[PDB]
Amino acid sequence: DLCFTNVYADSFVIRGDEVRQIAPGQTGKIADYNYKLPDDFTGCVIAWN
Amino acid sequence: ALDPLSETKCTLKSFTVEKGIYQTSNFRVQPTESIVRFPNITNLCPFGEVFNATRFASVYAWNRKRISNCVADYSVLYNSASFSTFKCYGVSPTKLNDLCFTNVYADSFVIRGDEVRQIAPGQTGKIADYNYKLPDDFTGCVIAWNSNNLDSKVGGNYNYLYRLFRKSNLKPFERDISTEIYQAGSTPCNGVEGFNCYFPLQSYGFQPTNGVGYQPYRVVVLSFELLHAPATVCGPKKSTNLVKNKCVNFNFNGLTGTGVLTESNKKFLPFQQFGRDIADTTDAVRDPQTL
Amino acid sequence: AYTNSFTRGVYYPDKVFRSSVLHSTQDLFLPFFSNVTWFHNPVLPFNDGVYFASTEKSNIIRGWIFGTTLDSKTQSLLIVNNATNVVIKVCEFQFCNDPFNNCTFEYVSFKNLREFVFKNIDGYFKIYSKHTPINDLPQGFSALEPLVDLPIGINITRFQTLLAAYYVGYLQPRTFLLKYNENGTITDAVDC
Amino acid sequence: GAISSVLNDILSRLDPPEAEVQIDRLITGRLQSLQTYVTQQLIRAAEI
Amino acid sequence: GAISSVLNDILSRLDPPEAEVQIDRLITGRLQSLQTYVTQQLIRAAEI
Ligand SMILES: *[C@@H]1O[C@H](CO)[C@@H](O[C@@H]2O[C@H](CO)[C@@H](O)[C@H](O)[C@H]2NC(C)=O)[C@H](O)[C@H]1NC(C)=O
Ligand SMILES: *[C@@H]1O[C@H](CO)[C@@H](O[C@@H]2O[C@H](CO)[C@@H](O)[C@H](O)[C@H]2NC(C)=O)[C@H](O)[C@H]1NC(C)=O
Ligand SMILES: *[C@@H]1O[C@H](CO)[C@@H](O)[C@H](O)[C@H]1NC(C)=O
Ligand SMILES: *[C@@H]1O[C@H](CO)[C@@H](O)[C@H](O)[C@H]1NC(C)=O
Ligand SMILES: *[C@@H]1O[C@H](CO)[C@@H](O)[C@H](O)[C@H]1NC(C)=O
Ligand SMILES: *[C@@H]1O[C@H](CO)[C@@H](O)[C@H](O)[C@H]1NC(C)=O
Ligand SMILES: *[C@@H]1O[C@H](CO)[C@@H](O)[C@H](O)[C@H]1NC(C)=O
């Protein structure tokens, strides 16, 4: 039911236990040095084996 | 912010300002310098002794090491890739380098993987209830890493134990090493095992082939003592020179503030670290590097 | 016997300097006008804290033992001032029945009235002490300045004296309103 | 209900996301305290 | 917004960390309710 101007699809691969780092305000190797989400992130994160 | 009249116009949200006096702004003197002053201790804290300890204690008899009067390089820990869990409550790992503490307690022990989550404030379960309890207001860092390579062997390592029964839940950092026969029923055991009379402890089944949930994990819990005493355990942060009679952003033993530092005439007694006020507002300090 | 601690047993609660202010604090304090059991050596129990006052012009009393069983295989704290050194140790000492290894700590430093507060409840042993020249327990007001905060973490449920009239009182958790003068010295207190 | 009444302590100990929650509690409390003050003063002023 | 208005229910049913949050909501509500009462009373007293 929602519209948006732009949608950004950021794609990559990690290991299982690091999926938890792909979220706002997380810490660790991934969240710090690889890919950082903002604290006010408004979107969907999709991850599958 | 062009001119004061323009500030007024913005304050009144009106292009036309009438005759009068209008409070528009709040002037403040901005600090010119940043001062860091920590006690001049050069002594690395013996973190290896805890982390690189050959043998860990059973969770029911968790070891406690006190850390004091040293500079703690926390980077060694949070920049290491050795740890699965490095959870800090009431503090941030990055911020640790800039903080002082009276004491630090390093509580070391070993548990199985699925029980690591019980090492956290206000958790429940065998560990959190009968072995090791963290308080709801725990200000510290919990570190845990898999030790399947070390603590597990072919045949099963049974050297590590846990308390399975207890008459009540443990209080925070309450250490119970008793081996009294647990009276599950109404019949006194008189130190004799049997029906409703069980031994309170039990071994961990640590085999290399065990599920990650059942594999051994070494856990070190750091508790930071935020108390009113001379702070001894400080970060690697470098002290700079003292500046007086200027608005400065000062930092004495991890106490932030912005103010004008002046030589005082207050008659501090030798033990007194710093002075407060009628309002309970800090208004005097004793320098760490200088009396 | 028993005497009254009229307003003795007040110490500085923390290392904060306060001047010309009335500050209310809740801590283990000696209740005002409380009974102090007078001794002229016994294994007296340690409760929340204890207050020790000794009137000893010739200074017979050298120190105190603090512990549980006050014997081997329980870490038992020892403070023995001998002339220059106030030797402090927390070894599992084997004490005498009437005195006068595994060392986890060691430190080395009637007109004469010495007042002392010992409180072990913070989890590290706290000593507060004051010496006042006097003419029973005197009527007047004194504030005890802290001496040593031994981070020893020894469980203490009992204490003995090593030797002189000494009065023992027990600290209780009470709120106290303290008066600070221009110099930040506690000059008066109210037991709330 | 914040970890520290001192605002500087919260910032020095915690990262901004985590600090925000604690600061919000302080703000809520301090703003309420000041509203109480202002209201009583309005009533008191009216009496004067 | 707390699970139960009854304080005892919250304590008996929830574990302490969770209970504290719910009790805080009750406290915030009850304290606000009493502040409202007192403020109206001072205004009413001034009329009297
Ligand atoms: C400090 O030591 C004392 C003396 O050993 C402990 O008190 C004993 O506690 C057990 C368990 O309740 C009782 O069976 C004994 O009768 C108690 N003895 C005395 C003389 O009171 C006390 O529990 C210890 N406290 C700590 C912090 O470990
Ligand atoms: C605070 O300390 C000052 C300095 O010791 C005290 O002022 C002295 O008071 C004594 C006794 O009245 C006089 O003999 C001295 O001449 C004073 N010295 C100075 C430098 O003024 C002051 O009385 C103390 N405050 C209190 C009330 O104890
Ligand atoms: C523990 O040993 C490792 C490997 O030598 C080292 O990198 C780590 O810094 C040590 N812990 C200390 C000294 O904090
Ligand atoms: C280092 O510490 C001693 C403590 O006596 C002091 O004399 C000296 O001034 C200090 N140096 C610095 C870096 O201020
Ligand atoms: C002190 O002890 C005596 C004898 O037990 C008693 O009569 C008196 O009330 C006590 N006074 C107090 C409580 O200080
Ligand atoms: C004293 O130290 C030895 C060696 O560490 C230890 O075995 C013993 O348990 C200690 N004292 C007692 C009796 O607890
Ligand atoms: C006091 O005791 C210490 C420790 O035994 C000793 O080194 C010192 O010489 C003693 N001083 C005397 C004999 O007064």
From Swiss-Prot, chain A:
Impact reported for K29N: In strain: Beta/B.1.351, Omicron/BA.1, Omicron/BA.2, Omicron/BA.2.12.1, Omicron/BA.2.75, Omicron/BA.4, Omicron/BA.5, Omicron/BQ.1.1, Omicron/XBB.1.5, Omicron/EG.5.1; May enhance affinity to human ACE2 receptor
Substitution effect: R20S: In strain: Omicron/BA.2, Omicron/BA.2.12.1, Omicron/BA.2.75, Omicron/BA.4, Omicron/BA.5, Omicron/BQ.1.1, Omicron/XBB.1.5, Omicron/EG.5.1
Region described as Integrin-binding motif: spans on this chain: 15-17
Function: Attaches the virion to the cell membrane by interacting with host receptor, initiating the infection. The major receptor is host ACE2. When S2/S2' has been cleaved, binding to the receptor triggers direct fusion at the cell membrane. When S2/S2' has not been cleaved, binding to the receptor results in internalization of the virus by endocytosis using host TFRC and GRM2 and leading to fusion of the virion membrane with the host endosomal membrane. Alternatively, may use NRP1/NRP2 and integrin as entry receptors.
Complex formation: Binds to host ACE2. RBD also interacts with the N-linked glycan on 'Asn-90' of ACE2. Cleavage of S generates a polybasic C-terminal sequence on S1 that binds to host Neuropilin-1 (NRP1) and Neuropilin-2 (NRP2) receptors. Interacts with host integrin alpha-5/beta-1 (ITGA5:ITGB1) and with ACE2 in complex with integrin alpha-5/beta-1 (ITGA5:ITGB1). May interact via cytoplasmic c-terminus with M protein. May interact (via N-terminus) with host bilirubin and biliverdin, thereby preventing antibody binding to the SARS-CoV-2 spike NTD via an allosteric mechanism.
Name listed for the protein in its UniProt record: Spike protein S1
Organism: Severe acute respiratory syndrome coronavirus 2
Lineage of the organism: Viruses, Riboviria, Orthornavirae, Pisuviricota, Pisoniviricetes
The gene coding this protein: S
